[PDB]
Design a protein around this ligand. Sequence first.
Ligand SMILES: [Ca+2]
Ligand SMILES: [Ca+2]
Ligand SMILES: [Ca+2]
Ligand SMILES: [Ca+2]
Ligand SMILES: [Ca+2]
Ligand SMILES: [Ca+2]
Ligand SMILES: [Ca+2]
Ligand SMILES: [Ca+2]
Ligand SMILES: [Hg+2]
Ligand SMILES: [Hg+2]
Ligand SMILES: [Hg+2]
Ligand SMILES: [Hg+2]
Ligand SMILES: [Hg+2]
Ligand SMILES: [Hg+2]
Ligand SMILES: [Hg+2]
Ligand SMILES: [Hg+2]
Ligand SMILES: [Hg+2]
Ligand SMILES: [Hg+2]
Ligand SMILES: [Hg+2]
Ligand SMILES: [Hg+2]
Ligand SMILES: [Hg+2]
Ligand SMILES: [Hg+2]
Ligand SMILES: [Hg+2]
Ligand SMILES: [Hg+2]
Ligand SMILES: [Hg+2]
Ligand SMILES: [Hg+2]
Ligand SMILES: [Hg+2]
Ligand SMILES: [Hg+2]
Ligand SMILES: [Hg+2]
Ligand SMILES: [Hg+2]
Ligand SMILES: [Hg+2]
Ligand SMILES: [Hg+2]
Ligand SMILES: [Hg+2]
Ligand SMILES: [Hg+2]
Ligand SMILES: [Hg+2]
Ligand SMILES: [Hg+2]
Lengths: 353, 353, 353, 353
Amino acid sequence: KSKTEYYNAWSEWERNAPPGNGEQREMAVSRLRDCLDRQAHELELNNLGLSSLPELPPHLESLVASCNSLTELPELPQSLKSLLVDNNNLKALSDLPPLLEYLGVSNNQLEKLPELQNSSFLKIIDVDNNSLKKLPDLPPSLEFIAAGNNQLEELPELQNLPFLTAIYADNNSLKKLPDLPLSLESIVAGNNILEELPELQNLPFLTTIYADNNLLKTLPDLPPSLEALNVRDNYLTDLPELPQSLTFLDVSENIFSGLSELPPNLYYLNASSNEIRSLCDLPPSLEELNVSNNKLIELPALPPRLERLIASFNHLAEVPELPQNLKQLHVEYNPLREFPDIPESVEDLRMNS
Amino acid sequence: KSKTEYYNAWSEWERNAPPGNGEQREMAVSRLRDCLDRQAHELELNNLGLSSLPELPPHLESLVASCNSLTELPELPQSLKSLLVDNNNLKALSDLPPLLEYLGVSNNQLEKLPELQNSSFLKIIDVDNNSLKKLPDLPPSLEFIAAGNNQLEELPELQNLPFLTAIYADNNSLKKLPDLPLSLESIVAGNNILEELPELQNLPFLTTIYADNNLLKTLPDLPPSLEALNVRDNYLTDLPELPQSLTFLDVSENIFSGLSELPPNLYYLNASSNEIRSLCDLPPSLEELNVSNNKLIELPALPPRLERLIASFNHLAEVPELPQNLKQLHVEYNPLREFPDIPESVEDLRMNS
Amino acid sequence: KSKTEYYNAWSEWERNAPPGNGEQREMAVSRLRDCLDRQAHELELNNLGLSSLPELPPHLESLVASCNSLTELPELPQSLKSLLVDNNNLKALSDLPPLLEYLGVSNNQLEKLPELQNSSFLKIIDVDNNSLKKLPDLPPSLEFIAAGNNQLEELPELQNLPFLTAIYADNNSLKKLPDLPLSLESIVAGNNILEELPELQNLPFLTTIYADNNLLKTLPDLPPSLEALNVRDNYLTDLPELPQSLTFLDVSENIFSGLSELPPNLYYLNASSNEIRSLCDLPPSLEELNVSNNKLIELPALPPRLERLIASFNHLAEVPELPQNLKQLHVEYNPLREFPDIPESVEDLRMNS
Amino acid sequence: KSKTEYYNAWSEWERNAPPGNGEQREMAVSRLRDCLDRQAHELELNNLGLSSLPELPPHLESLVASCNSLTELPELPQSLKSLLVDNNNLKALSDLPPLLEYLGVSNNQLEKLPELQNSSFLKIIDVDNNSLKKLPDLPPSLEFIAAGNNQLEELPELQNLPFLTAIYADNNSLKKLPDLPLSLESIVAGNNILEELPELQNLPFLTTIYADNNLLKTLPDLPPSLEALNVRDNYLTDLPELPQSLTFLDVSENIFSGLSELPPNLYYLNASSNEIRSLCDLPPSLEELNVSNNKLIELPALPPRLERLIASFNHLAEVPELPQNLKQLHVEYNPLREFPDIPESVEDLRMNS
Ligand SMILES: [Ca+2]
Ligand SMILES: [Ca+2]
Ligand SMILES: [Ca+2]
Ligand SMILES: [Ca+2]
Ligand SMILES: [Ca+2]
Ligand SMILES: [Ca+2]
Ligand SMILES: [Ca+2]
Ligand SMILES: [Ca+2]
Ligand SMILES: [Hg+2]
Ligand SMILES: [Hg+2]
Ligand SMILES: [Hg+2]
Ligand SMILES: [Hg+2]
Ligand SMILES: [Hg+2]
Ligand SMILES: [Hg+2]
Ligand SMILES: [Hg+2]
Ligand SMILES: [Hg+2]
Ligand SMILES: [Hg+2]
Ligand SMILES: [Hg+2]
Ligand SMILES: [Hg+2]
Ligand SMILES: [Hg+2]
Ligand SMILES: [Hg+2]
Ligand SMILES: [Hg+2]
Ligand SMILES: [Hg+2]
Ligand SMILES: [Hg+2]
Ligand SMILES: [Hg+2]
Ligand SMILES: [Hg+2]
Ligand SMILES: [Hg+2]
Ligand SMILES: [Hg+2]
Ligand SMILES: [Hg+2]
Ligand SMILES: [Hg+2]
Ligand SMILES: [Hg+2]
Ligand SMILES: [Hg+2]
Ligand SMILES: [Hg+2]
Ligand SMILES: [Hg+2]
Ligand SMILES: [Hg+2]
Ligand SMILES: [Hg+2]
């Protein structure tokens, strides 16, 4: 196919624009042209309303066509390494270029994908916000996958994936998680119907876990190097032993009546909306404490590093001495005897009765 | 004292106004005058900024002087039957006229009151929003008392009060409630530190109970004619047998995993922010259902009378058939397969993902 | 008709209940019975889901049947003086008992009413939240009418009504208001399409005006004894001379670049969301000042009576000295140099940057 | 200095930790060690509470020490090219390494900086959220500067800066802007006290302008290739001719009574909280329309590409036909005759009366 055949095919499609429709085909024909004419690497046709695309420049490596109205894709160069067509109306994808490394098709209406484990170089897959009832088996080169907000009832098996690092499977219908891979670094699976978590204690690189909004009564022993744990809105009464590496913990909307000693490097603690009665001493590394909406009548001595204190909706008659770097103080709706002495660092303040 | 002595005393006080201060003493001197001159029943000096009052017209029956800046009151006619001085800066009250029937002194800085049980005609007492550490014994003529938002650690004994009908003691520090009077109709005691409620089952007129935001793990058997129960934000797993008269129930922010059959006249049910998994059938009299922020994946068949459905933040894939008079539909943030068919009655709608 | 015929007619209707439907006809048959049996004045059938009513007890004076599902009403006793059927599905009303004094039919689907000016004792009419495209002429005995939230394009003529005291005609499509009656005390007509107000200066009892959310560029001279004026969200640049009786003024969401001297008894001033640059001195009676979201860089000296200061979203580098009774301070999002010294009265505080 | 001298100096400082204080000096001594031991490029000591730093490894190029508590910095290697010490308590900076390219010191308490125009390789300067009353002259290599939220009354002269691309000077006290450089691509200066903008029409690369929340009555002729304009909350009645390249326009909170034809590629239009009466036809490329809180009674025909329609708080009796890809519909509080027919694309809906 010659330059002139491309150019001409592109002027045909541009005149094919649904007349009123708002499609910026001229703008699109200019980008194809310069792209063919500059023999660029990547073609950017984002947000031009296209309800379709013409034949693409051969040898392109990356197609950026998101935020259009595609229901179908044209044939793609076999040189293609990156496909970014999020925010379209695709209802299915066909098999893909064989060198694809990056698949982005989130915010589409996908109901099924091709056989992903045949694409030997897919590193990153994003099919967030589609209508997938199930996931195909995944290729072993996969490094990252986001499949949140679909309608998944099960996930593929994951433990054999040699390079999987992160999974987003939140907002689905999983009742169970598969055994996880040793390389996994993070798992985000909030809002599923997990009645339990798989075994975690043997995962030496798992650093982040989100399992908020599920059905947990209990947690397994944690990965020894866990750093951030979010299990907000579950039915937990107790926690397993917490790794000394933990630095972010969200236990809000559970059913704790107290918390025993937290690990000593914790920076952020969100334990709001529990039934907590008492706090004993806090880690001195703690910078943010949110215990809003609990049943406290006294707070423990405040960590010297604290910069954020959210203790709204409790029964406190008084705030303990505040740290010289407090930046945010929110202690609205407590039966407060007196105004604590506000440090000069405080730049955001709320107080009430 | 003559008209002229009154008039003159009132012009002295009016010239005594702190100069800039914004006090509307002229306005006040006109009301005293016409009041003396019309020999009115009641004197209205509300919201004129007075930092004080002069001698009052003799024989008045009611003084309305709220929303001023009084720290002290003048001597009051012994004819006085009603004293409304809410929203002032009083830090104590002296003994009162002996015919007082109505005492209103809420939104002041009271730290102690006189010996109330000596005032034989006090029917209604309001000392909400003061700084009372304790309540005096109450007169047996008391019909109503509101002492919410003080710093009460205990309440007077109440069971001997022959006409007590309603108590507001919410937002205090009660760890315990006294045995309640047989005549009591309503008790409002949210936000105290109740570890338990007194015996209720023998109270044949108790119709309303608010004990939200306390420390209850369990409830006593209820008054057989209970109509409204609010126990939001406690630690309840189960309820006692619910009276068939119950028509308003708030169990939000407790720890229910389900609810068995509700009484058949219930009109309003707020069970949001629990851990509910399933609902079996609902009372057909139900007009409002709030089960927001639970763990539902299916709703039960909807009552024909329902006009308000708040089912935001759950896992529903679909809304069941809606009743022909639904007026409000809020089902935002559910993994909703499809839009339910909205009845023409619906005037307030929210839907999302 | 005998007791037994009533009783029996009522048991027929009760068995006629749509089977599942949730209708509390038994409850309704008990109230009719005791009502007939006690020969009560008023019959209360509120909120029982009735989709209809049987024949009513003769000689009743008041019917309370609101919050049901009526599309039609039964014949009413000619003794009827009060009809409260708000919150039903009526799509029309027939002519009414001739002694009716109180008509309440708000929250229904009325598209037309009978000839109201023939009912010689109608004092109060409420047909708020219906679908009335026009109002019938009104009877001269009318004292109050609320016809807000209908679809009125015009109002009846009002100036001849000898006792009209208050009108709610807000949320309609009026492009114009009729000349108003001398007795009128209040007019609420927010959210219409008023391009102008009628002449007001000759109304000696008008005390309250709501005309927020219309199309005013200008206001007529005001009633000399005006006390509350709300003209929020119009296109005003200037105000007419303001009566010294004015005590509530809402000029928020207009286009003022400043305000000259306010009357000296003003208690509340809401001038938020204007383009105000400067405030000169304030009335010393002022208790609430809301000037949020303006273009201020300095506030004027604060009135001694002020209890509420809302000055959020401005450019202030500092708050002036606060009055010893300030109760509420909201001065969030101002480029604040320093924290003002908070008086011990302040019970609600917000500060930020 | 030898490895051992470093190591030892670092153990001295670590033992110097204020005892309780929460400072993670051990963690810091490990990073210095491995950094010296790996002879890394960059040293990362973020968020360890340090109230100080020991001597740094020589030849480092980048220091990341933000989110500590420094009031002072140690001497820095002259090899230093990047200094990231945001979120500390520095009250002044000394002269910097001479090869510095990146200066990050936002969220500190700076009151004055050294003589910036002597640092010949500073490309990026961020001193957002400090207390600078004035800016020093800038070096000609500057590419980006953010000095928002300080207390600047004037800016340095900018027009001579050969490579300046972007300026953030929002939230200051500027009454005037300097003439701008030909290379400038974006200017963010919301919330200052601009009474006017400099000449813009000769700026061929200016693409973005934020001047929301100032005092503009009028705008200069715009840069011919302008793409995004935000002038929310000013006093504009009219706009200059708008470039056909404009694609983002925010005129919310101004005083427009209408808008004539918008440029044909506009994607987003926020004209909420004006006084708009009518809209004539819209650009067919428009994807977001926000005209909330205006005075509309009819909308114009809706663009085929629209995905977001925010038309809350108007007087509409009906919504026109909705586009097949509408994703968001918010038309709450309009006197809506009927529910429009919702397209299957709509995933976020609000409707009300
Ligand atoms: Ca709780
Ligand atoms: Ca609570
Ligand atoms: Ca829960
Ligand atoms: Ca939840
Ligand atoms: Ca403004
Ligand atoms: Ca503003
Ligand atoms: Ca407006
Ligand atoms: Ca408005
Ligand atoms: Hg190309
Ligand atoms: Hg898009
Ligand atoms: Hg995009
Ligand atoms: Hg307490
Ligand atoms: Hg409390
Ligand atoms: Hg301290
Ligand atoms: Hg907060
Ligand atoms: Hg009197
Ligand atoms: Hg007041
Ligand atoms: Hg009051
Ligand atoms: Hg589900
Ligand atoms: Hg979900
Ligand atoms: Hg039905
Ligand atoms: Hg809601
Ligand atoms: Hg009766
Ligand atoms: Hg109702
Ligand atoms: Hg009602
Ligand atoms: Hg300023
Ligand atoms: Hg500002
Ligand atoms: Hg003062
Ligand atoms: Hg506020
Ligand atoms: Hg190093
Ligand atoms: Hg920090
Ligand atoms: Hg940071
Ligand atoms: Hg309208
Ligand atoms: Hg309206
Ligand atoms: Hg269409
Ligand atoms: Hg909205």
